[PDB]
Amino acid sequence: IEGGWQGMVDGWYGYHHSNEQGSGYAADKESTQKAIDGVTNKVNSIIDKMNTQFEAVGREFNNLERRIENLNKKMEDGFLDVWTYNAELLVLMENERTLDFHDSNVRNLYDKVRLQLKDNAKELGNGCFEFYHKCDNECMESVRNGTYDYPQYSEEARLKREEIS
Amino acid sequence: IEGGWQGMVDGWYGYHHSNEQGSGYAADKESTQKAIDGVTNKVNSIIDKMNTQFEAVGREFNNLERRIENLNKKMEDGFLDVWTYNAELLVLMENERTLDFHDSNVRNLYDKVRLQLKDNAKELGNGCFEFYHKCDNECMESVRNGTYDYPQYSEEARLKREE
Amino acid sequence: IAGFIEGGWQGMVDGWYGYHHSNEQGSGYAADKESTQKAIDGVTNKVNSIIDKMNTQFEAVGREFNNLERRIENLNKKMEDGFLDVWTYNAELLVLMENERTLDFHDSNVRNLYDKVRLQLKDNAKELGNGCFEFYHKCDNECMESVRNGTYDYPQYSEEARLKREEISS
Ligand SMILES: *[C@H]1O[C@H](CO)[C@@H](O[C@@H]2O[C@H](CO)[C@@H](O)[C@H](O)[C@H]2NC(C)=O)[C@H](O)[C@H]1NC(C)=O
Ligand SMILES: *[C@H]1O[C@H](CO)[C@@H](O)[C@H](O)[C@H]1NC(C)=O
């Protein structure tokens, strides 16, 4: 799958079809909503799990108390280093996960289509299927539904498949 | 592949079949054991990698040493915040991974079956294969064994499709 | 000669992921250079971010409290021990976690390479079930290249493939 549909506005993952009647985009609302809910939950947990207490970070040691002030410096610097590393790596790690999540969702959508069409359509290798029969707007809907009737078009599909000969 | 078998008790991942003789569950013991070993290892590493040394957390500063007591408070609170966040996020993260691990294992089990019976089965979308030939209890066992004899049923298979 | 799902090619010195073919003209290994380079770049980036994101400042860790300042020395001990525990756990778990991810990454890349082939050679070749495809037609060195390219012309060999598909029976 090469890139994304700027023309598809209504969702995150979906379909594009073209036939004799015309062409258009249609979003898969189920998988889109699950993905939006998951990603929102990810961002929220990363925010909500932080538990911050009250504190008064202010330096109140005198010039004959510099060993204690240094002890405080080591501590403040220590926590800055811990949080910086953990925050940075958490972001890098969860970003990798989020992008793979989207990849995984598109693939599942592609396989749900593939397993219906079998040899009634040619996998073009770019996320698109070329049909071996005439697939109208009702036929296209059934492919999104998960109700595509394979035997109904299988004969017609078999003629055009060996018509290449 | 939607939903788990309450009827399948003997393992974690497995098979359900239905034929003329009846229907029933059977667990895949190889992939189940790998999954149990991995998950147990995950829990153990999360426990074992912690090293807690001895210490005496006790407050022993007087009423003219409150700046030092506050310094200790900032420290104790600091570590409580670090451990709380890391523990919480570690759990949430590894739980996501554990559930995807199971998903991944089921898919591998499904592919092992798919590659063993090419044109002999009709892939449905729910993790299920509809056979194009009559597959009895012996035939079903061989699919679990990993020694399903494809050529033996291959001819019969090409007939039910055009019926 | 096996496939991916029963070990690696010691004979493929070329790259990380790739192909092995055998036909009448001969046999050999061929690395997929695109996916190999992406994997090397990703893994190198992983190692570099894990190193580069660390931010270390100057400090003079030395114990300079006297024998009537042991409560303060203990406060320092709790702190030093605290950070040692935090870094140890995080470092250990980061390594274990990212190693799992790295190995699954490689697994995933090999599977993608296998599927790109499978979806081209539909019923023109037999999935042997060990990462290898047995062709039902004569596939020469140009034919093999096209399978790696992603340009394999299925209709061109489909008829020949259908003739041989019905032999074992009669
Ligand atoms: C999913 O789309 C399918 C497309 O086949 C719908 O079924 C068709 O509906 C049309 C008009 O609504 C009817 O003429 C037929 O009953 C169906 N067509 C065929 C060829 O059988 C189906 O209604 C859609 N899903 C839902 C839940 O409505
Ligand atoms: C596995 O089950 C089959 C039944 O199809 C049986 O014939 C065979 O003996 C079993 N395999 C082995 C190696 O014993």
Short mmCIF file of N, CA and C in Angstrom, two decimals, chain C residues 97-151:
data_model
loop_
_atom_site.label_atom_id
_atom_site.label_comp_id
_atom_site.label_asym_id
_atom_site.label_seq_id
_atom_site.Cartn_x
_atom_site.Cartn_y
_atom_site.Cartn_z
N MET C 97 13.38 -5.96 26.61
CA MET C 97 12.20 -5.56 25.84
C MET C 97 12.54 -5.29 24.38
N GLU C 98 13.57 -4.49 24.16
CA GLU C 98 13.96 -4.15 22.79
C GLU C 98 14.55 -5.33 22.02
N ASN C 99 15.18 -6.27 22.71
CA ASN C 99 15.64 -7.50 22.07
C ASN C 99 14.48 -8.33 21.56
N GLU C 100 13.42 -8.47 22.35
CA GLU C 100 12.21 -9.15 21.90
C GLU C 100 11.68 -8.48 20.63
N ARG C 101 11.59 -7.16 20.67
CA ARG C 101 11.11 -6.38 19.52
C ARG C 101 11.98 -6.57 18.28
N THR C 102 13.30 -6.53 18.46
CA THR C 102 14.23 -6.71 17.35
C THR C 102 14.09 -8.09 16.68
N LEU C 103 13.92 -9.14 17.48
CA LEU C 103 13.80 -10.47 16.90
C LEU C 103 12.47 -10.62 16.17
N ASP C 104 11.40 -10.06 16.72
CA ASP C 104 10.09 -10.08 16.04
C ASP C 104 10.09 -9.25 14.76
N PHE C 105 10.85 -8.16 14.76
CA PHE C 105 11.06 -7.35 13.57
C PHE C 105 11.60 -8.21 12.41
N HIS C 106 12.68 -8.96 12.67
CA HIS C 106 13.27 -9.84 11.66
C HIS C 106 12.30 -10.89 11.21
N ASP C 107 11.62 -11.53 12.15
CA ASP C 107 10.58 -12.49 11.81
C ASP C 107 9.57 -11.87 10.86
N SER C 108 9.11 -10.67 11.20
CA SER C 108 8.09 -9.98 10.42
C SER C 108 8.57 -9.68 9.00
N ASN C 109 9.83 -9.28 8.86
CA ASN C 109 10.40 -8.94 7.56
C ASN C 109 10.52 -10.15 6.63
N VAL C 110 10.90 -11.30 7.18
CA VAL C 110 11.00 -12.53 6.40
C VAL C 110 9.61 -12.96 5.90
N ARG C 111 8.62 -12.91 6.78
CA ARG C 111 7.23 -13.24 6.44
C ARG C 111 6.67 -12.35 5.33
N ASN C 112 6.99 -11.05 5.38
CA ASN C 112 6.57 -10.13 4.33
C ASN C 112 7.18 -10.49 2.99
N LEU C 113 8.45 -10.89 3.02
CA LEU C 113 9.17 -11.30 1.82
C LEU C 113 8.52 -12.56 1.22
N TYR C 114 8.12 -13.48 2.09
CA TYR C 114 7.46 -14.71 1.67
C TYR C 114 6.08 -14.44 1.07
N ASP C 115 5.34 -13.50 1.64
CA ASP C 115 4.00 -13.18 1.15
C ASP C 115 4.02 -12.43 -0.19
N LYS C 116 4.99 -11.54 -0.37
CA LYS C 116 5.18 -10.85 -1.65
C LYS C 116 5.38 -11.85 -2.80
N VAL C 117 6.08 -12.95 -2.51
CA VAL C 117 6.25 -14.02 -3.48
C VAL C 117 4.95 -14.80 -3.67
N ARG C 118 4.35 -15.24 -2.56
CA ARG C 118 3.14 -16.05 -2.61
C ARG C 118 2.02 -15.40 -3.43
N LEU C 119 1.80 -14.10 -3.21
CA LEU C 119 0.71 -13.39 -3.88
C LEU C 119 0.95 -13.17 -5.37
N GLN C 120 2.19 -13.34 -5.82
CA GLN C 120 2.50 -13.30 -7.25
C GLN C 120 2.25 -14.67 -7.91
N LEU C 121 2.89 -15.69 -7.35
CA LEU C 121 2.79 -17.04 -7.88
C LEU C 121 1.58 -17.65 -7.17
N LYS C 122 0.43 -17.54 -7.78
CA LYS C 122 -0.73 -18.08 -7.15
C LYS C 122 -0.66 -19.57 -7.34
N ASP C 123 -1.50 -20.10 -8.20
CA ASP C 123 -1.56 -21.55 -8.42
C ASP C 123 -0.50 -21.99 -9.46
N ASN C 124 0.37 -21.08 -9.87
CA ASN C 124 1.48 -21.41 -10.76
C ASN C 124 2.63 -22.08 -10.02
N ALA C 125 2.60 -22.06 -8.69
CA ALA C 125 3.58 -22.79 -7.89
C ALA C 125 2.97 -23.36 -6.62
N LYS C 126 3.57 -24.45 -6.15
CA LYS C 126 3.10 -25.17 -4.98
C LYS C 126 3.87 -24.73 -3.73
N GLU C 127 3.16 -24.17 -2.74
CA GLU C 127 3.76 -23.85 -1.44
C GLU C 127 4.18 -25.14 -0.74
N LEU C 128 5.49 -25.37 -0.67
CA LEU C 128 5.98 -26.60 -0.03
C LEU C 128 5.79 -26.63 1.48
N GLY C 129 5.51 -25.48 2.09
CA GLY C 129 5.27 -25.42 3.53
C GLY C 129 6.51 -25.22 4.39
N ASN C 130 7.67 -25.07 3.76
CA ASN C 130 8.92 -24.77 4.48
C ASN C 130 9.60 -23.47 4.03
N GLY C 131 8.84 -22.54 3.46
CA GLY C 131 9.39 -21.28 2.93
C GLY C 131 9.75 -21.31 1.45
N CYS C 132 9.58 -22.48 0.83
CA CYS C 132 9.93 -22.66 -0.58
C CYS C 132 8.71 -22.86 -1.46
N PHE C 133 8.82 -22.40 -2.70
CA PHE C 133 7.79 -22.59 -3.71
C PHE C 133 8.34 -23.48 -4.81
N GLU C 134 7.62 -24.56 -5.13
CA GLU C 134 7.95 -25.39 -6.29
C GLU C 134 7.12 -24.92 -7.47
N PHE C 135 7.78 -24.50 -8.54
CA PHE C 135 7.09 -24.02 -9.74
C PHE C 135 6.50 -25.17 -10.54
N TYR C 136 5.32 -24.93 -11.12
CA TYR C 136 4.66 -25.89 -12.01
C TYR C 136 5.07 -25.68 -13.47
N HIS C 137 5.90 -24.67 -13.72
CA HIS C 137 6.43 -24.42 -15.05
C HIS C 137 7.91 -24.17 -14.99
N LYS C 138 8.54 -24.09 -16.16
CA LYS C 138 9.97 -23.81 -16.26
C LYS C 138 10.23 -22.32 -16.00
N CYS C 139 10.91 -22.03 -14.89
CA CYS C 139 11.21 -20.66 -14.50
C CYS C 139 12.71 -20.41 -14.62
N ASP C 140 13.10 -19.69 -15.67
CA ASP C 140 14.51 -19.39 -15.94
C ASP C 140 15.00 -18.18 -15.13
N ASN C 141 16.26 -17.80 -15.32
CA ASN C 141 16.88 -16.72 -14.55
C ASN C 141 16.19 -15.38 -14.73
N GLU C 142 15.55 -15.16 -15.87
CA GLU C 142 14.75 -13.94 -16.06
C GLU C 142 13.45 -14.05 -15.27
N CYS C 143 12.83 -15.22 -15.32
CA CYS C 143 11.60 -15.50 -14.58
C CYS C 143 11.82 -15.36 -13.07
N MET C 144 12.96 -15.84 -12.58
CA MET C 144 13.31 -15.74 -11.16
C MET C 144 13.50 -14.29 -10.72
N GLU C 145 14.18 -13.50 -11.55
CA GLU C 145 14.39 -12.08 -11.28
C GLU C 145 13.06 -11.34 -11.12
N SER C 146 12.11 -11.62 -12.02
CA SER C 146 10.81 -10.95 -11.99
C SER C 146 10.03 -11.23 -10.70
N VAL C 147 10.26 -12.40 -10.11
CA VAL C 147 9.63 -12.75 -8.83
C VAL C 147 10.21 -11.91 -7.69
N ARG C 148 11.50 -11.58 -7.78
CA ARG C 148 12.17 -10.70 -6.82
C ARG C 148 11.79 -9.24 -7.08
N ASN C 149 11.74 -8.85 -8.36
CA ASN C 149 11.30 -7.51 -8.78
C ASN C 149 9.94 -7.14 -8.22
N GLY C 150 9.02 -8.11 -8.28
CA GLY C 150 7.60 -7.85 -8.08
C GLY C 150 6.86 -7.68 -9.40
N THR C 151 7.48 -8.14 -10.50
CA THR C 151 6.95 -7.95 -11.86
C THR C 151 6.58 -9.27 -12.54
#
